[PDB]
């Protein structure tokens, strides 16, 4: 085994390095899942707030000397927000990852 020792162990040294990439990916999907539920509940909150504000600001017309007008826009954010959540491929989590 003069020269089988090194090789074969350098081989069981790749897995000890790749199987970790797994324990790492798992962690990454731990945070990604939680980070998904937060964006979930921030896109909702911010949306509500914006209409709450569009509704209030409009009130100023009959209250202030000068009145501008806040303009809404795209819901294109609701599409994107959808992938970011719907694309829940985040769950993903192997098992042999463990010993």
């Amino acid at each position: 085994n003069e020269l089988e020792v090194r090789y074969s162990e350098v081989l069981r040294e790749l897995e000890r390095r790749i199987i970790h990439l797994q324990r790492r990916i798992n962690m990454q999907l731990q945070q990604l899942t939680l980070l998904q539920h937060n964006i979930k509940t921030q896109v909702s909150q911010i949306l509500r707030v914006e209409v709450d504000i569009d509704v209030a600001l409009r009130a100023c017309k009959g209250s202030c000397a000068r009145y501008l007008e806040y303009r809404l826009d795209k819901e294109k954010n609701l599409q994107l927000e959808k992938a970011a959540s719907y694309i829940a491929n985040l769950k993903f989590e192997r098992f042999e990852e463990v010993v």
């Binding site: 790749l14 945070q31 921030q42 707030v49 504000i53 600001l57 009130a59 009959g62 209250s63």
Partner: protein
Amino acid sequence: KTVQKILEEVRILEQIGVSHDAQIQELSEMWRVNQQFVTRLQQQLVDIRQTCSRPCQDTTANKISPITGKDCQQVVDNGGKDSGLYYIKPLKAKQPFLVFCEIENGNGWTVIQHRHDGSVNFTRDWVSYREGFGYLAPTLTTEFWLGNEKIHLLTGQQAYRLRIDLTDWENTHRYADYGHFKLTPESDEYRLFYSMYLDGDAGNAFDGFDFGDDPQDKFYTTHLGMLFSTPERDNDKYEGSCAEQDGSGWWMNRCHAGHLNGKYYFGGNYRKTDVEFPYDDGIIWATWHDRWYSLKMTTMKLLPMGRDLSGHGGQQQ
């Protein structure tokens, strides 16, 4: 070289993962910051909700004094200092009304009418003339006709001295006065009445004015005693409706020598150019300008007969 690549590949996949571990944090930071932004806006929303809850200030309404009286004079007699809008309640008046009080050297001139820029169509019906129309304001730079009924109540309450202030486009201000001015109740239409032309450098256009066109001009243009007439109510002493011809209620006789409710022609004086027909409807006062020179400003104010002027008559022997 795969055995050798399956390595470099992993050396790379490790480098990436680590960055992914950074990018994941950069997102949480990014999220926390935002979640704070939402708070800051939460606060701003309640803040703005409050600031924008108050309604505009109705300045005009804010310049209507709380002082009152039989007329504008009593108003002065009650503290009224500056000229403006006030509520006054003549005797038989059932509901006090808003009027523009002109206050001079301690006198409460209660304005009956005013012409200012032909922005108010004066071609109104009877009921419209008895109720009033036009606009009041804090400065008397608005046109209107207080109302025949009020004017009646107001004048039959005491003895009033009517004053007429005319103004030409060259901006000249002459005036005419009439004592004991008043109007009979709607029963007898709203007949004009006064004792006499008290004074004035504007000329007595009411007792009539000779035109030379006919034998009875001063009689065909005497307003004293004339009933009130409007476009749809002919009460004049003329086969036709002088009220409908000039198109504006007024005390019509064989038409007029003094018509302050006439159509407001801008510029110097309107004309009969390109004779489409006679009609000298405009705002005129013969005794101070041809019946073809519509005035720029106009105002008919009332003041208690019991006021004015001075004396100094010493004993003498």
